[PDB]
Amino acid sequence: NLCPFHEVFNATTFASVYAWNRKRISNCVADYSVIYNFAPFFAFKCYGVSPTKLNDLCFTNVYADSFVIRGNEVSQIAPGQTGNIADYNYKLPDDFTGCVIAWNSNKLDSKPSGNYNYLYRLFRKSKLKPFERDISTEIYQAGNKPCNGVAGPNCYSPLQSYGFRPTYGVGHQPYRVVVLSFELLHAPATVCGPKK
């Protein structure tokens, strides 16, 4: 059925790290070798699955999470990692069985005036849980005094923009991460690998 793996990868517009995307791709012939079309892959971490034995097992669902981060924050997309992306924006579980494919996109998601369309969440009242999303714009409150809504002293907005530019370092350039997560629920699997 030619499972796409192309709307996730060859997308004109990606998503910010706080409002990341998730595509439940199912009922298809997996075609994992289509992914290898892109050459400049900066990371191919493959926890839980052999990187050559993908197209022989069958899973109920696969999830292709898609966001854009810095280059120095791509090490936080891994099981058990902590920081400022693995606990406020995108937390992935300790029982991860997937792929952390993440290439460089400085030539597509960075402008010389600033890509302030790509956001990032700096403040939360609690850490994040595995595969949980928080699209909220409510003000933070560091002080013990009520902010009475929108305010400025000791009442900060949580989201801080990334502001990508072409003249950044490798660790500060935009990185389009496509995380693959295979799910193995005890259900009739709809995704299977090609075999003669």
């Binding site: 700096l122 403040f123 560091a142 801080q160 923009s161 003249t167 370092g169 500060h172």
Partner: protein, 594 residues
């Protein structure tokens, strides 16, 4: 939420947004410096105004949290660098007056040139002309005319401006909960909060004075040597009892003695090691210098340089079009962009400056993981010390033979070692009495022990006590000779250079003994030595996070300034001066009377 816990989120948001605004301001300042254009001037001015307004607003927000309740030390240091009122503690009229005083002082120093000789058609500018006629001259009268014409033309304008500048600076320092403006400038070498590693400003004066008293014999022997050699080319204008005129000291202030080498040659039959012909013979252009320099830096153990630094930086001349300022600087623009503006020439001095101005960029790539307000040297003397120890290790004949710019058949000798040691000493230990005297005079002027009606009386008296040079002309009170120095008229701290030398020789002596080197200290190299590279990176990674009394201890073993690595570095020379200075009187005194 405690005050310590609510300060951390404020600091985090400040660090992120200030990193963005600092990148915008620094990129605007680059493209202004590499391209002189009115549009770039307006862009830099707008970015700087936005950054200054942001800094004022965040300082006003940061005054809320007192420092007494905070127990963490990095947050304490960040808020201490963030809670400073600065010049805003004054009234609006007084702040505007101080800003205008600074601006007209800077423009008077920058644009002012002497029109004294003959008709006012002949007016030599300070930057191309006056430095040239001060560096290379053999005339007592011409140097006397140039010296008298500048100080008097500039100082007569400076002095009534300078009294008001001193009064306003002392007022804004007193309102800033400090004691004086000198006490404000000594607030950078201040540690308060750590047990066993603590520093006070009175301790900073005392330690500087003690280190100068320790270093005095070396400078005194060098003084006797340069007086003895300057007697030969200058007859009947210098007395054998002591002292030499201050208008003869290479530069126009006495700051550096580097241009006296042609008249203070240790051995004229043996030329100094120059590689410019050999550097240009092998067609090394402008990229091979900064490729072999990064080869040396990776040989030490320090990491590579990113691809976003070769394309962005400007390492070659800009050409006839695209006017730019050819002053080498190590631009840390912020978020991962490390660029090193520099107009590379085919010269050894350019090679060692490329090693020097990339030491500052390897410090910048090492403390980049630190929070935004801690992204600096632990004091102001760490950066230039790091850069100049890279330059000192790059200047060894062994490293030049290793990288290919020296024939193996060329051999070293004690004569060449003596020549190199005196050449380095004329730059290094020449500037330490000048720095100490100038900063002591400025400290006592700002503190109030020096009366206003007796100010320049002090310089030429203090100068007859510390440096030891005669006044070329009797100068009366109506002047501000101290000023006429880029670092005084533009309100800069000057003790950074003293601290830099006293730390650079400690760093070299402490690193080249971890590299397993046997022999003289002036031939040490960090190349092919990861054991010293990791030791240096142990300090480079800290930044301003840990106090300087500990970061100095993490590489040397001492928690204070020490001139013993300086006197042992410059030991092979010292002895030679002790042997040669036996048929001439040594020291100086105020027995001179005109």
């Amino acid at each position: 939420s405690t005050i310590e816990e609510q300060a951390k989120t404020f600091l985090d948001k400040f660090n992120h947004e200030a990193e963005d605004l600092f990148y915008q301001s620094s990129l605007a300042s680059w493209n202004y410096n590499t391209n002189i254009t009115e549009e770039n001037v307006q862009n830099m001015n707008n970015a700087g105004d936005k950054w200054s307004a942001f800094l004022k607003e965040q300082s006003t927000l940061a005054q809320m949290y007192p420092l007494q309740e905070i127990q963490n030390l990095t947050v304490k240091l960040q808020l201490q660098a963030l809670q400073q009122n600065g010049s805003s503690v004054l009234s609006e009229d007084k702040s505007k007056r101080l800003n205008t005083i600074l601006n007209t002082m800077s423009t008077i120093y920058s644009t002012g040139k002497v029109c004294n000789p003959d008709n006012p058609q002949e007016c030599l500018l300070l930057e191309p002309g006056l430095n040239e006629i001060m560096a290379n001259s053999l005339d007592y009268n011409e140097r006397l005319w140039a010296w008298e014409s500048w100080r008097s033309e500039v100082g007569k304008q400076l002095r009534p401006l300078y009294e008001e500048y001193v009064v306003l600076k002392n007022e804004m320092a007193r309102a800033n909960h400090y004691e004086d403006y000198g006490d404000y400038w000594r607030g950078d070498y201040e540690v308060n909060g750590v047990d066993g590693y603590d520093y006070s400003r009175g301790q900073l004066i005392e330690d500087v004075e003690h280190t100068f008293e320790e270093i005095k014999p070396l400078y005194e022997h060098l003084h006797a040597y340069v007086r003895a050699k300057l007697m030969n080319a200058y007859p009947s204008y210098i007395s054998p009892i002591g002292c030499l005129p201050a208008h003869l000291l290479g530069d126009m202030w006495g700051r550096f003695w580097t241009n006296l080498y042609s008249l203070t040659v240790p051995f004229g039959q043996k030329p100094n090691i120059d590689v410019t012909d050999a550097m240009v013979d092998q067609a090394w252009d402008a990229q091979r210098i900064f490729k072999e320099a990064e080869k040396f830096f990776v040989s030490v153990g320090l990491p590579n340089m990113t691809q976003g630094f070769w394309e962005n930086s400007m390492l070659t001349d800009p050409g006839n079009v695209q006017k730019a300022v050819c002053h080498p600087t190590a631009w840390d623009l912020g978020k991962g962009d490390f660029r090193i503006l520099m107009c590379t020439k085919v010269t050894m001095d350019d090679f060692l400056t490329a090693h020097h101005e990339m030491g500052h960029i390897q410090y910048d790539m090492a403390y980049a993981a630190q929070p935004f307000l801690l992204r600096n040297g632990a004091n102001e003397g760490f950066h230039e010390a790091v850069g100049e120890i890279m330059s000192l290790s790059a200047a060894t004949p062994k490293h030049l033979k290793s990288i290919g710019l020296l024939s193996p058949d060329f051999q070293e000798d004690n004569e060449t070692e003596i020549n190199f040691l005196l050449k380095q000493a004329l730059t290094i230990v020449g500037t330490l009495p000048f720095t100490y005297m100038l900063e002591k005079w400025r400290w006592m002027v700002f503190k109030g022990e020096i009366p206003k009606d007796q100010w320049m009386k002090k310089w030429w008296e203090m100068k007859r006590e510390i440096v030891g040079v005669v006044e070329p002309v009797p100068h009366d009170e109506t002047y501000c000779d101290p000023a006429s120095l880029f670092h005084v008229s533009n309100d800069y701290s000057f003790i950074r250079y003293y601290t830099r030398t006293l730390y650079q020789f400690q760093f070299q002596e402490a690193l080249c003994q971890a590299a397993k080197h046997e022999g003289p200290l002036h031939k040490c190299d960090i190349s092919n030595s990861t054991e010293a590279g990791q030791k240096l990176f142990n300090m480079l990674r800290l930044g301003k996070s840990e106090p300087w009394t500990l970061a100095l201890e993490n590489v040397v073993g001492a928690k204070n300034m020490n001139v013993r690595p300086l006197l042992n570095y410059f030991e092979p020379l010292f002895t030679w001066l002790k042997d040669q200075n036996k048929n001439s009187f040594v020291g100086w005194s105020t027995d001179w009377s005109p």
